Amino acid sequence: GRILDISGQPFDFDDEMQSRSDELAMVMKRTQEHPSSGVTPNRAAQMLRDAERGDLTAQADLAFDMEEKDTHL
Amino acid sequence: NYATVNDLCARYTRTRLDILTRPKTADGQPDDAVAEQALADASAFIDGYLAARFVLPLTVVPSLLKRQCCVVAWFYLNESQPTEQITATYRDTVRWLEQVRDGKTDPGVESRTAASPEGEDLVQVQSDPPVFSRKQKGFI
């Protein structure tokens, strides 16, 4: 029952989805920022540096806006 | 009228005002309605020279306009035979009113609270509703 992963660390496998854990109900439901409204290169650099440091939220929203906005892209 | 007869008889000596007025009345005795009528005509003159860029029932009266009404009333009251100085000062105040109408000089304010009289929009432009302006934070 103690299934080992690829890295050889035993653990217990659970059928419950991690999001549906009754503890992350208010952090899995986020209304998107849409940061690509009035972007200035300074602010784009700021969000890129924030993503580099570890906070990937702004970068992901910016990428989503770039995907849906720029038709050639 | 902008100025009352009690101010015209103070800036200009009352005795000379009576001398100027007593012939014009019907009876021949010093009268006050002649001076008020002259002040009303001078105020009409100034009103015509100011209505170019002001709402004419002035919300606040510029404090110099009392002087500018007294001088024009005095000139209007010396129409038979005026002094050279009266004519020169009347020409000066006509020049000032022309400058005010053109826009070279503002009339002034009320000396009590330093408020300038309002007026209609001298310049007014209309365009189609703005689209693709920088205020449209969408897109970008």
Side-chain angles (χ1 to χ4, degrees), chain B residues 15-119:
Chain B
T15 68
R16 170 67 165 187
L17 177 66
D18 280 330
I19 286 178
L20 290 190
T21 299
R22 67 180 65 250
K24 288 180 174 55
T25 196
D27 172 57
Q29 211 64 235
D31 202 321
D32 206 59
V34 181
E36 289 183 2
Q37 183 179 0
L39 284 168
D41 268 355
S43 175
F45 188 74
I46 290 174
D47 271 8
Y49 262 88
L50 297 202
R53 60 170 201 177
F54 287 97
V55 58
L56 183 62
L58 298 186
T59 81
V60 297
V61 180
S63 45
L64 186 65
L65 282 186
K66 197 155 54 185
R67 175 82 179 94
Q68 299 293 295
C69 178
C70 292
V71 54
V72 176
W74 198 245
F75 171 66
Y76 276 32
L77 205 62
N78 293 253
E79 88 294 335
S80 295
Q81 166 83 67
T83 317
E84 183 80 281
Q85 180 50 65
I86 286 181
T87 300
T89 308
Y90 166 72
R91 302 291 212 257
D92 273 9
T93 186
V94 174
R95 185 175 314 160
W96 184 80
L97 287 177
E98 281 179 2
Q99 279 185 353
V100 168
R101 170 203 67 191
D102 290 340
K104 268 54 192 191
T105 310
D106 44 351
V109 305
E110 200 193 9
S111 298
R112 294 175 63 254
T113 179
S116 64
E118 65 183 1

Side-chain angles (χ1 to χ4, degrees), chain A residues 36-38 69, chain B residues 137-139:
Chain A
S36 184
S37 62
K69 271 199 174 53
Chain B
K137 268 307 166 292
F139 195 63

